[PDB]
Amino acid sequence: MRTHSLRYFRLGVSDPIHGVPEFISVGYVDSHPITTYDSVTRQKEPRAPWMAENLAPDHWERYTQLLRGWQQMFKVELKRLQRHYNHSGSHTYQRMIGCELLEDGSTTGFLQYAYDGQDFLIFNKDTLSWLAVDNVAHTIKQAWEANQHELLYQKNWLEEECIAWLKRFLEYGKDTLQRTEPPLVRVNRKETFPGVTALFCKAHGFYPPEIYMTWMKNGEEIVQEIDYGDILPSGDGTYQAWASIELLYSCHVEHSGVHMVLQV
Amino acid sequence: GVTQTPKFQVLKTGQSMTLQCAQDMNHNSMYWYRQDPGMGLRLIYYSASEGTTDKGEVPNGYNVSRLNKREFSLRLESAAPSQTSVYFCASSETDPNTGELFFGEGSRLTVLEDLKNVFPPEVAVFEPSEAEISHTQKATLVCLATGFYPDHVELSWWVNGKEVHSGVCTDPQPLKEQPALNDSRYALSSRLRVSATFWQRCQVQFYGLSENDEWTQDRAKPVTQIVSAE
Amino acid sequence: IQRTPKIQVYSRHPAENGKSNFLNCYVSGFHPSDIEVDLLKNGERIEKVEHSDLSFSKDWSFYLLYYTEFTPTEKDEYACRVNHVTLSQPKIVKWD
Amino acid sequence: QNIDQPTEMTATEGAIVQINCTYQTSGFNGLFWYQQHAGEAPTFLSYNVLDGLEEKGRFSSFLSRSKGYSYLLLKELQMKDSASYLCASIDSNYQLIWGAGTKLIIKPDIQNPDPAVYQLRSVCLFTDFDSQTNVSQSKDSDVYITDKCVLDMRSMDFKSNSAVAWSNDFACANAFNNSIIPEDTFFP
Ligand SMILES: *[C@H](C)/C=N/c1c(NC[C@H](O)[C@H](O)[C@H](O)CO)[nH]c(=O)[nH]c1=O
């Protein structure tokens, strides 16, 4: 297998703008949304068909109750953060928990929090400590660190339970997450500004999104400014990317263990 | 911490019933359990945070209401003899709980077809044998609370207006006076041992009927009472 | 610290006038979550616009994908109108 | 799925007892141990999620996540340790699955046994026997026999075992005939 990941996000907004829910919590297996919950629906629903098919009502039933409580803790934890910072108006609270099951069988785990879209607390599962960015984060840190049971549980979840779910979902969504759709690469040459010749290496219709693209001169890497295009969703479950140079040259693409070379 | 009422209750099949639970600790999660002999606690209903409740393992015959952050009341709409159990109300800071789960004192609820077999106990005290006093130089008093139904009793030993515990032994379970019978009445023994020179009151608290319980029998209404022997 | 949305307007397949395609508008890198997105045809809002749910980035920002089925023509000018707390006036981004 | 622990365990006061608990669950988010005295509310003893042994005085909790098992170790046993011990595991859906409980029975160390059957005042008392002997129930439904009970006379630092037999034919000599009593049992 390639590198796969599980993640759950939480967003808490104080004093929202009529339409914006007070709380939203979304799960992903890689680039794919898998679960959704919000303060409006007050329910955990699937965001992938293979999630709906492989999880019984008892799973959605339980986690729905769990999320209502999580929603409540977020409201209180955000209010208290604002009280420390002496902040009025609308402010955001965020959380990200997750794990990666690496190509080589090795695993990683993350749990971090943010206030106003900026790093607030960052959990260290190796030292069982919280990394505080300021003195407000430091007060929450001292408090959180007092409950050794919760820290140990958080380590066990990230290290064991998380990877276990990720492995379940990978199987559930095997046909989607594990497939490989090779890229359609092309090179475009154009006399732009008088003299300047711009070469475009454009790739499309590939899955997974992770692609590597570079330009090389005579065989060696370009000691010139390569402009890179973002890996964007095509909207059909496939992705598109590019890389340009200002000019022999050859475009190099690696995607899903296959190397590609396009000379000019 | 967790205050749950009542400690005991006698119900007739089909009677409504409400068990109260309240917590001082500012906990968000509250739970209703039943403890039956031979099996692990069974969750009836739970409240993960104020503003939500959900079915447990055994929700049939029950409903709950998370009145506020502090109260979580259970309700038996039409009592059934299957509902004869010990109800435990519990609370914890949050759900999921990786901390201490706080339990209420418990509620012994007994459901019957009719109340015509509810009887308080007869309490009798047996003085130590002269043989034991001369052979061990110790004196064992014995107490028997017999013919009671349901098993809603609390035996205490009283030496000179003050309750005692040292030298005391009450059976942890009562014996069934008629083991073959479904509604067997109960018997419970206790022993208080003192020295021969110290020898030279048994109080049973029965939890039975209340004012609201209608009684249409010739014999005396088996209400909550203290039965003694000296 | 408020971050303004990065707007990218592109097609599903390499565009060709007269060939049926999909026009995508990928709004990303913004903070806070309150965004307003519409796909325009010669200035007018397209009603048949399917979009993604508000999605989450590891850097705490958010992203979305708004898309419509379209047939590019020489005559026709497509664009993507976005509004956010960072924007004083909605930003119209023309498709190249 | 299934949490299993022994129904009952018996050990002698002053000794050590290890109560085992195996969890056969779909996922694992922590294991608990609760103490429950006869007719009382359960109380938190420990919570274990990671591997290892944790001492809290005379009580210790151990967990092996690989082996899908944990134990409760009670050292220097006291009569007060006579309770039920409930273990409970958290599955991947965060739901507590409780075990049926282990009734711990502690046998007192009877330094001077003096078995005897005494007649009080329609009641027969079997007293001062060693924790080794066992009291069996009644044959005739007209006769009632209570199991062994342990009383501690804290002042005289003395513990003793007692069984009570009462009836409405019934004599003291015949009272405990359905039980294997010591050969040296005193009959006054
Ligand atoms: C369906 C399983 C949705 N879950 C969900 C979770 N689950 C992950 C984890 O159990 C949770 O974050 C705990 O609090 C970890 O200690 N997390 C989340 O934030 N949102 C969800 O929708």
What is the makeup of the main sheet of chain A? 8 strands, antiparallel
Instruction: Give the amount of beta strand of chain A, in percent.
Output: 35-45%
Most extensive contact: B-D, 48 and 54 residues
Number of helices of chain B: 2
Instruction: Kindly name the structural category of chain B.
Output: mainly beta
Shape of chain A: globular
3D shape of chain B: globular
Topology, number of strands of chain B: 20
Q: Please tally the β strands of chain A and state the result.
A: 16
CATH homology superfamily of the largest domain in chain B = Immunoglobulins
Alpha carbon gyration radius of chain B = 21 Å
Instruction: Please give the radius of gyration of chain A in angstroms.
Output: 23 Å
The strands making up the biggest β-sheet of chain A line up spatially as 4-3-2-1-5-6-7-8
What does this structure look like?
The complex is a heterotetramer of chains A (264), B (230), C (96) and D (188). Chain A has 264 residues and is an alpha+beta fold. Chain A has two domains: 1-179, 2-Layer Sandwich (Murine Class I Major Histocompatibility Complex, H2-DB, Chain A, domain 1), CATH 3.30.500; 180-264, Immunoglobulin-like, CATH 2.60.40.10. Chain A is built from five helices and 16 strands. In chain A, strand 3 (32-38) and strand 4 (45-46) form a beta hairpin. Chain A is globular and about 65 Å long. With 230 residues, chain B is mainly beta. Chain B folds into two domains: 1-113, Sandwich (Immunoglobulin-like); 114-230, Immunoglobulins (Immunoglobulin-like), CATH 2.60.40. The radius of gyration of chain B is 21 Å and the shape is globular. The two termini of chain B are 37 Å apart. Chain C is mostly beta strands and 96 residues long. Chain C has one domain (1-96): Sandwich (Immunoglobulin-like). Chain C has no helices and nine strands. Chain C has strands at residues 6-11, 21-30, 36-41, 44-45, 50-51, 55-56, 62-70, 78-83, 91-94. In chain C, the strands form two sheets. In chain C, strands 1, 2, 5, 6 and 7 form a five-stranded antiparallel sheet that branches. Chain C is globular. Chain D is mostly beta strands and 188 residues long. In chain D, a hairpin with a 6-residue loop joins strand 4 and strand 5 (43-48). Classes of the chains: A alpha+beta (264), B mainly beta (230), C mainly beta (96), D mainly beta (188). The structure holds the ligand *[C@H](C)/C=N/c1c(NC[C@H](O)[C@H](O)[C@H](O)CO)[nH]c(=O)[nH]c1=O. The ligand *[C@H](C)/C=N/c1c(NC[C@H](O)[C@H](O)[C@H](O)CO)[nH]c(=O)[nH]c1=O is lined by residues 8, 10, 25, 27, 35, 37, 44, 63, 67, 97, 154, 157 of chain A. Chain A: 2-amino-4-oxopteridine-6-carbaldehyde binds at residue 44. Chain A: One of its GO terms (biological process) is antigen processing and presentation of exogenous antigen. Chain A: It is a single-pass type I membrane protein. Chain A: It comes from Homo sapiens. Chain A: Pyridoxal binds at residue 44.
